[PDB]
Design an enzyme around this catalytic site. Structure first.
Site, PDB file in Angstrom:
ATOM      1  N   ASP A   1       4.334   8.587  -3.900  1.00 44.97           N
ATOM      2  CA  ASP A   1       4.917   7.559  -4.763  1.00 44.97           C
ATOM      3  C   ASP A   1       4.036   7.644  -6.119  1.00 44.97           C
ATOM      4  O   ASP A   1       4.865   7.546  -7.137  1.00 44.97           O
ATOM      5  CB  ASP A   1       4.560   5.987  -4.140  1.00 44.97           C
ATOM      6  CG  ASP A   1       5.370   5.617  -3.021  1.00 44.97           C
ATOM      7  OD1 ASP A   1       6.305   5.502  -3.022  1.00 44.97           O
ATOM      8  OD2 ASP A   1       4.357   5.676  -1.946  1.00 44.97           O
TER       9      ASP A   1
ATOM     10  N   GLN B   1       5.730  10.948  -7.993  1.00 48.86           N
ATOM     11  CA  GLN B   1       7.133  10.813  -8.321  1.00 48.86           C
ATOM     12  C   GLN B   1       7.429  10.813  -9.922  1.00 48.86           C
ATOM     13  O   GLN B   1       8.351  11.295 -10.253  1.00 48.86           O
ATOM     14  CB  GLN B   1       7.797   9.485  -7.609  1.00 48.86           C
ATOM     15  CG  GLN B   1       7.976   9.913  -6.118  1.00 48.86           C
ATOM     16  CD  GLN B   1       8.518   8.765  -5.416  1.00 48.86           C
ATOM     17  OE1 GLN B   1       9.284   7.817  -5.864  1.00 48.86           O
ATOM     18  NE2 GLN B   1       8.060   8.599  -4.109  1.00 48.86           N
TER      19      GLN B   1
ATOM     20  N   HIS C   1      11.099   4.306  -0.413  1.00 49.70           N
ATOM     21  CA  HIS C   1      10.455   2.978  -0.786  1.00 49.70           C
ATOM     22  C   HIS C   1      10.722   2.502  -2.251  1.00 49.70           C
ATOM     23  O   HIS C   1      10.972   3.511  -3.162  1.00 49.70           O
ATOM     24  CB  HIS C   1       8.880   3.371  -0.647  1.00 49.70           C
ATOM     25  CG  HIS C   1       8.150   2.066  -0.809  1.00 49.70           C
ATOM     26  ND1 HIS C   1       8.224   1.055  -0.525  1.00 49.70           N
ATOM     27  CD2 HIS C   1       6.935   2.525  -1.546  1.00 49.70           C
ATOM     28  CE1 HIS C   1       6.919   0.289  -0.883  1.00 49.70           C
ATOM     29  NE2 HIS C   1       6.324   1.200  -1.639  1.00 49.70           N
TER      30      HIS C   1
ATOM     31  N   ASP D   1       7.476  -4.211   2.301  1.00 49.53           N
ATOM     32  CA  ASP D   1       7.100  -3.197   2.959  1.00 49.53           C
ATOM     33  C   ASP D   1       5.287  -3.002   2.560  1.00 49.53           C
ATOM     34  O   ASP D   1       4.489  -2.753   3.374  1.00 49.53           O
ATOM     35  CB  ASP D   1       7.629  -1.890   2.221  1.00 49.53           C
ATOM     36  CG  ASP D   1       7.061  -0.553   2.886  1.00 49.53           C
ATOM     37  OD1 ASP D   1       7.797  -0.143   3.985  1.00 49.53           O
ATOM     38  OD2 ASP D   1       6.415   0.049   2.219  1.00 49.53           O
TER      39      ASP D   1
ATOM     40  N   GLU E   1       2.170  -2.963   5.481  1.00 48.37           N
ATOM     41  CA  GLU E   1       1.364  -2.076   5.714  1.00 48.37           C
ATOM     42  C   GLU E   1      -0.033  -2.455   5.586  1.00 48.37           C
ATOM     43  O   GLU E   1      -1.042  -2.415   5.973  1.00 48.37           O
ATOM     44  CB  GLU E   1       1.815  -0.964   4.845  1.00 48.37           C
ATOM     45  CG  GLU E   1       1.743  -0.959   3.536  1.00 48.37           C
ATOM     46  CD  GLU E   1       2.545  -0.180   2.742  1.00 48.37           C
ATOM     47  OE1 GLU E   1       3.606   0.600   3.213  1.00 48.37           O
ATOM     48  OE2 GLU E   1       2.177   0.369   1.524  1.00 48.37           O
TER      49      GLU E   1
ATOM     50  N   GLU F   1      -5.870   0.480  25.293  1.00 44.89           N
ATOM     51  CA  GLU F   1      -5.026  -0.538  25.733  1.00 44.89           C
ATOM     52  C   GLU F   1      -4.111  -1.264  25.066  1.00 44.89           C
ATOM     53  O   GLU F   1      -3.162  -1.872  25.352  1.00 44.89           O
ATOM     54  CB  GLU F   1      -5.774  -1.868  26.864  1.00 44.89           C
ATOM     55  CG  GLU F   1      -4.969  -2.667  27.464  1.00 44.89           C
ATOM     56  CD  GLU F   1      -5.745  -3.628  28.475  1.00 44.89           C
ATOM     57  OE1 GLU F   1      -6.950  -3.231  28.970  1.00 44.89           O
ATOM     58  OE2 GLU F   1      -5.129  -4.303  28.997  1.00 44.89           O
TER      59      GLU F   1
END
Ligand SMILES: NC(=O)C1=CN([C@@H]2O[C@H](COP(=O)(O)OP(=O)(O)OC[C@H]3O[C@@H](n4cnc5c(N)ncnc54)[C@H](OP(=O)(O)O)[C@@H]3O)[C@@H](O)[C@H]2O)C=CC1
Ligand SMILES: NC(=O)C1=CN([C@@H]2O[C@H](COP(=O)(O)OP(=O)(O)OC[C@H]3O[C@@H](n4cnc5c(N)ncnc54)[C@H](OP(=O)(O)O)[C@@H]3O)[C@@H](O)[C@H]2O)C=CC1
Ligand SMILES: CC(C)NC(=O)C(=O)O
Ligand SMILES: CC(C)NC(=O)C(=O)O
Ligand SMILES: [Mg+2]
Ligand SMILES: [Mg+2]
Ligand SMILES: [Mg+2]
Ligand SMILES: [Mg+2]
Lengths: 328, 329
Positions: free
Chosen positions: A82, A85, A107, A190, A194, A230
């Site tokens: 990002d 870009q 995104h 988004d 995250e 687990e």
């Protein structure tokens, strides 16, 4: 909301179009491979002849420099970081693209926070898989897929959304389900996910759990089986049957312990912190802080990676995973 | 510590022992099935001719009442709820078992917190799979297993640990790895983990995440894909490659967001809470509270189940799972 599946979407809108995949990292490799497997016309465009260029060659592509890829592209997909870009856009795309080529993101950060202002005569759209890159490819190879959002910023052609949905189909996402969203919704949800759960929250919950047991003198291997290994087994139940199906599978002891402690650990204070996170995403403040961190050299990122890689949870985990995963 | 695998463990010490599996629920079905498939001599013992009796018949067993199973057993395994074990013991096991039969648990709670005081002439040991019951079975059916702890409370025979390891191998856990522990360690670590992360922490993290997005007006289906479904995909990376492998897979944006916000959400206050949770396990206080809550009718448990099953996260999730999991025509 409409959840689109394979049967709802045609690939015809993107057939016989050259799709330049800019980058060949976590998302880039997966899109390029899955789109080629799907029978679309992919070219890989890269700035450097380095690791991802070698990887593209090893996967049977003949990569091009970005400037050369974009010059032949009908659809250009920004699958570099990002924070890169803007400079890629300015240096290797804006002046080299065919006029009216589609600009496509995974995104919505750069478009939504007005970092890149696209030409008015290009379709601008997004397919955001709700998955880490390597699993966009793995799922596809195993005959499945991951969910995705699609969104449209500019629809010059009158079929931007159809194109987005066709790319989503081409990378497997319509095997799972694709939902229409917006560049605003996608970017804010988004970032939030995250931050508070998929990366931030789970990683810190794991590390704090494991380190509590090891600090208190329990066997680190026990700690790793209980607080790391687990988790995957439990989350698989959630994935298949919800929180209700998971809770029915665990002991009554665990149901009472979880219901009461969960609310103690993740209490109204933590809920308030999630609202603060979300606020700082919606105000642009997170994006301002990320830009500044990147311009400092991303030291927060590199420092954490170096400390993590050599830490007890990771060295004990690597040892145990190698033992567990020998197979038949 | 040694991590025992199949090649390290013999089944010989439990060949030609009758193993009575008491209960046929989340662990019991899995143990019974996996041990039968491994070639061991299993009988299922149940108090009631109800749902798990019918399930055991459907699976090809001929269940017995508890008292009758235990009377022919060489190894007795307590796979009914922890809060039921004392009554089961007093009513259907103590006075019916063979003298010297082994007493085996899957969690150390009843022995460790002195709820059941075993006879002095029985081996007492444990195999604690570090997995939910249905995955103990599923792993095995897929040619794998889940890790387990083993522990010995009384070694009268001289081969209690070898037996515990043999059972662990029989139920598949030595395909993954088995570690020796104690009744104290297992009980304390097990209670900790399911409280702070495996059940409590993760379920409340998920709900709080999802709920925040829905309250704030986003599409609930987006919230589900982001905060529920994707977690499985991420956790799969951790499981395979650790936290480092996971973090290398996600975007730089996500690395910076996660590293900073994670430490905001899960801060020192949360770490301090985890020490307090641990303390209450170690002091007996949790065990006290649990017993009292069970004796009230476990309202906390049932109220949560009823509320949860009808809640937005679960109704939206059932709808979306059914759509996602239909598969190719
Ligand atoms: N990672 C994920 O799973 C997800 C990412 N996203 C989005 O996908 C997009 C791409 O992200 P992601 O896959 O993580 O990207 P990566 O960080 O994996 O990108 C690496 C690619 O970019 C190239 N690159 C790196 N730095 C530069 C540079 N300074 N200049 C030129 N090219 C460079 C690399 O080339 P080289 O080999 O030469 O270094 C490589 O081809 C982003 O918009 C992201 O938000 C969406 C969903 C999830
Ligand atoms: N669930 C898990 O994944 C894990 C559990 N453990 C441990 O395994 C042991 C067993 O737990 P779990 O599998 O959860 O047990 P379950 O709660 O699944 O036990 C259900 C079984 O017990 C029987 N049962 C229920 N209530 C009673 C009653 N009042 N009297 C007689 N029998 C009854 C049921 O019979 P019916 O069909 O008639 O109701 C059924 O056969 C515990 O020590 C637990 O801590 C260890 C690891 C993980
Ligand atoms: C959790 C992670 C894979 N998701 C992202 O959206 C990202 O990497 O930016
Ligand atoms: C998380 C859960 C399966 N673990 C337990 O130990 C239990 O159910 O008691
Ligand atoms: Mg994402
Ligand atoms: Mg992201
Ligand atoms: Mg457990
Ligand atoms: Mg437990």
């Amino acid at each position: 909301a409409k959840i689109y599946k394979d049967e709802d979407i045609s690939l015809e809108p993107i057939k016989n179009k050259t799709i330049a995949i800019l980058g060949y990292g976590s998302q880039g490799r997966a899109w390029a491979l899955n789109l080629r497997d799907s029978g679309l016309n992919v070219v890989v465009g890269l700035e450097r002849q380095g690791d991802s260029w070698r990887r593209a060659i090893d996967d049977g592509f003949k990569p091009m420099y970005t400037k050369d890829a974009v010059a032949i592209a009908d659809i250009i997909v920004f699958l570099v970081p990002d924070m890169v870009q803007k400079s890629l856009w300015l240096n290797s795309v804006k002046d080299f693209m065919k006029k009216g080529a589609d600009l496509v993101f995974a995104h919505g950060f750069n478009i939504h926070f007005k970092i890149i202002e696209p030409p008015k005569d290009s379709d601008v759209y997004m397919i955001a898989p709700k998955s880490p890159g390597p699993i966009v490819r793995r799922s596809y190879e195993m005959g499945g897929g991951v969910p995705a959002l699609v969104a449209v910023y500019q629809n010059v052609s009158g079929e931007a959304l159809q194109k987005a949905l066709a790319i989503a189909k081409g990378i497997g996402c319509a095997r799972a389900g694709v939902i229409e969203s917006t560049f605003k919704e996608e970017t804010e949800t988004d970032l939030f996910g995250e931050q508070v759960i998929l990366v931030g929250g789970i990683m810190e919950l794991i590390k704090a759990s494991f380190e509590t047991l090891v600090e208190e003198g329990y066997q680190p291997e026990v700690a790793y089986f209980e607080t790391v290994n687990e988790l995957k087994l439990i989350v698989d139940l959630i994935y298949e049957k919800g929180l209700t199906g998971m809770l029915r599978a665990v002991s009554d002891t665990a149901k009472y312990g979880g219901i009461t402690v969960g609310k103690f650990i993740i209490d109204k204070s933590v809920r308030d912190k999630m609202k603060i996170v979300l606020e700082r995403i919606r105000s642009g403040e997170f994006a301002r802080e990320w830009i500044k961190e990147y311009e400092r050299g991303m030291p927060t990122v590199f420092k954490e990676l170096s400390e993590l890689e050599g830490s007890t949870i990771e060295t004990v985990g690597r040892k145990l995973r190698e033992m567990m995963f020998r197979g038949m």
